Design a protein around this nucleic acid. Structure first.
Ligand SMILES: [Mg+2]
Ligand SMILES: [Mg+2]
Ligand SMILES: [Mg+2]
Lengths: 48, 141, 358, 82, 69, 202, 82
RNA sequence: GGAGGUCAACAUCAAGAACUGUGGGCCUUUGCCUAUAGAACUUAUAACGAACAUGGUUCUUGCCUUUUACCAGAACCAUCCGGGUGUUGUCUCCAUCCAUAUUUUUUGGAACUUUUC
RNA sequence: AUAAAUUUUUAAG
């Protein structure tokens, strides 16, 4: 959605949430348990 | 033409530009175009995740929401003499087809089933690999 | 299976159940002596659509739903005698396997034009000719081809002996009381108290007591056909028939090896055809998996390949398969919390389903 | 293409009346019509130019020899014209 | 352009009402886009048959009213 | 709560073809038909019905501005709750309208959508067993496949009249990106691949 | 090889689609494409222990207008005054 | 008169899948039925914001000397940072459809004479 | 044949 349009309206510069997309997607693989648990916090705060 | 005016609302752009933007922002973008990817990562599999008190393995954990499960009669219906274990029933069943595997849900939602199994095929190597090209992923017909 | 959560609400459930049977045609419903209700439906999603529409619209009451189960059936593969409970009568029944291409035929219901076979539903199509369909196609006894009486869902009854020919008239009396008793013990079952399937019944001979009687025989004879058919099935080396879904799968190509595992795991474990697809990086994969193992299956696929792929199960050809075990063992191994060993699958399901009814 | 032709086609099914060059009116269910008004009709009465009437089954008529066709007034409403 | 749909009337006896207040009868054998009729012969309407088979020109036909249903 | 719907007599859409006249067509059995529509999952069916609808009713309530010009499909005959959020179709569902062939001969038509999952075939078997002719909708990419088989044996087995429509050609180019030629070759490959199941008919 | 390869499969697949061939040639022909989208190490497998930069290699100059020099003189032995 | 404004005021934005005006019939204004015209904005993986906080009451917990301050779930409400559309006002910058004649149409089989009324 | 990870402090008596 951010992109394909080419016609649309502004957003208050703090509404674009740049980093939401990363913690939606899977954790990937490598990361040590610190960052995975960081993900779970970001979900829990989102869903809520 | 490009933008509205000093009050600066309703930007109006053009393909070549919006391309170049696409190009740049490549570090910062979600990049995944197949809805069928998020399978249990949509919302509703989260809400189901909570409300039944499960945890998708990569999932956010929440609170019981219906905390006291401990009340129970000693009751023959679901018992062991009468039940056959063939396949385990992992959770993701219970989050995938909620009303079925899970006796007695409360406040559950509708998982959305599935999408078309995207075929999308992109050619990202060459700038000059032309638009329409028979791509080795395809079968020969 | 179904039970409503609190006993005092049994009525409300019923008042919805009848509704559902109407609104969703496909479903088929049952009770038992148990008070359990039984809900038979097409496929897993279909059970979902129901049970949701059961709880959140028609009946509102929460209920307890079992682990997904399956149907079964009762077949057999080969002095012989039987008795009445008040020794004025007796029956003894012959039972055999039937042609896989016969039973194949019946479950395909057909108009039989051309040089083709015909289905049994039209049995009042030319009866002698009908025996020509039989003699001709099925290698059927021309004398039984004479003697064929009457058919039911998956199987059919026949007659062989002289004291038949003592009273083909006096039996021409009790034909349609027997055809009941046959439907009777067919719909029910010896082991699972579940429908019998694919069996040939050639009667031995029917002793009727001296002077017969008026209303003794009438409804005296049908249950005696119950013990008749059963007794005829037992010594015939029974087995237990399990359905088989005809799997369809679609994948991107390089993800194929993945599928192999699943099937190796799910015991359906036959993928018959890998059909390349044209112009699109897909593989149709046609396969089979039994119903009982198919429980979560479609997810196991849909996940394990990370969003590419899809699956569907379904039942058309109405194929069946023997379940591997030895249909009775006193020495059997029953796991208690693990999937049983295939040296007895069937003994298990007997001693379970019987522990549902009793 | 001709809008009268279209109208005629539409009138298929309906009970049309139909006079020829001869002046022999018919009235019947319009079975089939073509670009050339080659009409077929069912259950059709047939008046002579002088007066007398005759019932008949499935008349065919060639548009060349047709004079004018009366269609039912329901077709006035819709939706051929616009 | 389009063919006259007379396949219903094929191999049936028809009253070909023809030019000048005349008539013809006979079983229908064929036709074309001009509505010429080829028919196995019959009388001219007391009555008298001429020919074994007959061909009627398109222009000449007023009507071809079916004798058989 | 349980479904969507319209409950009133004055908000039902205007329906540009003047209903009562449609009811006039309804007299002759000759001019009306029953078209059932079936295919495999996600083959475009309900969408297609909605092509007919939005092409028929003049001003719809259920359009948001979104699908009006937009992106998400207005899926009109869907109408339940379950069939909405589940994202699917369960109870087969009708729509009637009169519409014109190119002739301008405008026939009354009963369309009936049918579910495309293979655990709902039951509620297609109805849609056949009633309906007069059926459109089997083939999704070009998927190509025909065991489900389209058992369909077409089930259509013609019950003595119905079929027409095929190849669907979702956006997926042809704008995803697969198949040079024009090889695409033509593909369509041919389907057609050849279907005629082997429609035997005495081509 | 990227262009040349590409146009080689231009004509090569162009074969299977437009042409009409034998069975046992065609089956193999498509086994090619299959292992292609399975990436070829079924056909590429070997001894890789040698380096492109380190190992002194010689890129030979031939072109199909070359008669290879057809040397049977180096085929047989001489007298060595050395 | 046109373009704009990091300008203002006043309306309207969560619902029977849902708005409004009008003609006609009935009851007796409401209301029901019928006909007709017009519907910006926002809604179906449901919504004004592909964003994301705080407070109050009430229960269930969790830390556990007591209270502020708190741990994490629910119900019912509130506040706050923002938004769209419409009308009016004001300000700034500029201007005063084939082309052609041999069976279905348009290259005619039309005319003359006579009776009845 | 496993990828399952709670917390965290200031004032007043
Ligand atoms: Mg649909
Ligand atoms: Mg003190
Ligand atoms: Mg104190």
């Amino acid at each position: 959605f951010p992109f394909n349009r080419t016609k649309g309206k502004m957003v208050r510069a703090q509404d674009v949430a740049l980093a939401k997309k990363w913690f939606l997607q899977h954790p990937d693989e490598e990361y040590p348990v610190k960052v995975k648990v960081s993900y779970q916090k970001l979900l829990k705060n989102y869903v809520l | 033409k490009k933008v509205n005016g000093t009050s600066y609302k309703k930007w109006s752009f053009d393909l070549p530009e919006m391309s170049n933007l696409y190009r740049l922002s490549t570090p910062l973008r979600d990049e995944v175009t197949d809805k069928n990817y998020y399978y249990l990562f949509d919302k509703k599999s989260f809400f189901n995740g909570k409300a039944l008190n499960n945890a998708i393995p990569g999932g956010p954990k929440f609170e019981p929401l219906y905390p006291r499960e401990e009340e129970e009669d000693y009751n023959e219906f679901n018992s062991i003499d009468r039940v056959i274990f063939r396949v385990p029933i992992r959770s993701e069943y219970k989050v995938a087809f909620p009303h079925l595997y899970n006796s007695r849900p409360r406040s559950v939602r509708i998982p959305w089933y599935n999408n078309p199994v995207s075929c999308i095929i992109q050619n990202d190597e060459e700038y000059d690999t032309p638009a329409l090209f028979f791509d080795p992923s395809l079968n020969p017909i | 299976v179904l039970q409503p959560l609190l006993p005092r609400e049994l009525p409300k459930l019923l008042d919805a159940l009848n509704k559902i049977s109407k609104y969703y045609p496909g479903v088929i419903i049952k009770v038992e002596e148990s008070g359990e209700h039984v809900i038979l439906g097409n496929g897993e999603l279909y059970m979902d659509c129901l049970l949701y529409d059961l709880r959140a619209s028609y009946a509102k009451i929460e209920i307890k739903i079992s682990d997904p189960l399956t149907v079964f059936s009762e077949s057999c593969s080969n002095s012989r005698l039987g008795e009445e409970n008040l020794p004025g009568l007796s029956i003894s029944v012959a039972a055999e396997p039937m042609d896989s291409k016969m039973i194949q035929d019946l479950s395909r219901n057909t108009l039989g034009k051309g040089q083709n076979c015909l289905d049994i539903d039209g049995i009042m199509d030319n009866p002698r000719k009908l025996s020509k369909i039989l003699r001709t196609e099925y290698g059927w006894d021309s004398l039984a081809s004479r003697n064929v009486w009457s058919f039911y869902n998956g199987n059919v009854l026949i007659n062989d002996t002289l004291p038949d020919e003592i009273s083909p008239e006096l039996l021409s009396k009790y034909k349609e009381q027997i055809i009941q008793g046959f439907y009777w013990a067919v719909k029910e079952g010896p082991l699972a108290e579940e429908p019998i399937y694919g069996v040939q019944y050639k009667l031995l001979s029917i002793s009727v007591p001296s002077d017969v009687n008026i209303d003794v025989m009438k409804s005296q004879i049908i249950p005696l056909m119950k013990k008749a058919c059963y007794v005829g099935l037992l010594t015939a080396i029974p087995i237990l028939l399990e359905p088989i879904y005809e799997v369809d799968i679609t994948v991107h190509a390089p993800l194929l090896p993945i599928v192999e595992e699943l099937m190796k795991k799910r015991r359906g474990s036959r993928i018959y055809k890998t059909i390349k697809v044209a112009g699109t990086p897909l593989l149709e994969v046609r396969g089979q998996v039994p119903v009982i193992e198919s429980a979560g299956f479609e997810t196991d696929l849909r996940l394990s390949t990370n969003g590419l792929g899809m699956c569907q199960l379904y039942f058309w050809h109405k194929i069946w398969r023997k379940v591997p075990g030895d249909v009775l063992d006193k020495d059997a191994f029953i796991p208690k919390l693990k999937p049983a060993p295939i040296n007895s699958l069937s003994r298990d399901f007997v001693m379970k389903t019987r522990r549902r009814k009793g | 293409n001709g809008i009268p032709v279209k109208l005629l086609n539409e009138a298929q099914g309906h009970i049309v009346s139909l006079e020829l060059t001869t002046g022999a009116t018919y009235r019947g269910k319009l079975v089939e019509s073509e670009d050339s008004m080659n009409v077929q009709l069912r259950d059709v009465i047939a008046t002579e130019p002088q007066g007398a009437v005759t019932h008949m089954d499935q008349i065919f008529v060639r548009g060349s020899q047709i004079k004018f066709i009366v269609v039912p007034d329901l077709l006035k409403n819709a939706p051929l014209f616009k | 352009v389009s063919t006259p749909e007379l396949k219903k009337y094929m191999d049936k006896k028809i009253l070909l009402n023809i030019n000048g207040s005349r008539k013809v009868a006979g079983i229908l054998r064929g036709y074309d886009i001009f509505l010429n009729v080829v028919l196995d012969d019959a009388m001219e309407i007391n009555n008298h048959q001429l020919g074994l088979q007959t061909v009627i020109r398109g222009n000449s036909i007023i009507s071809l009213e079916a004798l058989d249903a | 709560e349980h479904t969507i719907f319209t409950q009133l007599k004055k908000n039902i859409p205007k329906t540009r073809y003047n209903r009562d006249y449609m009811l006039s067509m309804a007299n002759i059995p000759e001019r009306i038909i029953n078209v059932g529509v079936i295919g495999p999952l996600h083959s475009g069916k309900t969408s297609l019905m909605d092509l007919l609808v939005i092409d028929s009713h003049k001003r719809i309530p259920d359009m948001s501005k979104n699908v009006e010009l937009g992106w998400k499909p207005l899926r009109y005959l869907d109408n339940l709750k379950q069939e909405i959020d589940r994202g699917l179709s369960i109870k087969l569902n009708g729509s009637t309208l009169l519409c014109t062939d190119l002739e301008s001969k405008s026939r009354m038509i009963n369309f009936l959508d049918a579910p495309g999952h293979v655990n709902f075939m039951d509620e297609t078997a109805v849609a056949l067993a009633a309906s007069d002719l059926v459109l089997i909708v083939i999704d070009v990419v998927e190509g025909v496949t065991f489900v389209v088989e058992q369909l077409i044996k089930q259509s013609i087995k019950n003595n119905v009249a079929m027409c095929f429509v190849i669907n979702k050609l956006d997926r042809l180019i704008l995803d697969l990106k198949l040079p024009p030629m090889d695409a033509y070759l593909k369509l041919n490959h389907i057609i050849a691949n279907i005629n082997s199941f429609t035997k005495g008919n081509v | 090889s990227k262009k040349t390869h590409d146009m080689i499969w231009e004509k090569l697949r162009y074969i299977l689609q437009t042409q009409e061939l034998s069975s046992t040639l065609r089956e193999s022909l498509e086994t090619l494409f299959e292992i292609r989208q399975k990436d070829y190490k079924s056909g590429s497998q070997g001894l890789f222990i040698l380096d492109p930069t380190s190992y002194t290699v010689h890129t030979h100059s031939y072109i199909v207008s070359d008669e290879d020099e057809a040397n049977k003189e180096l085929g047989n032995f001489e007298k060595c005054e050395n």
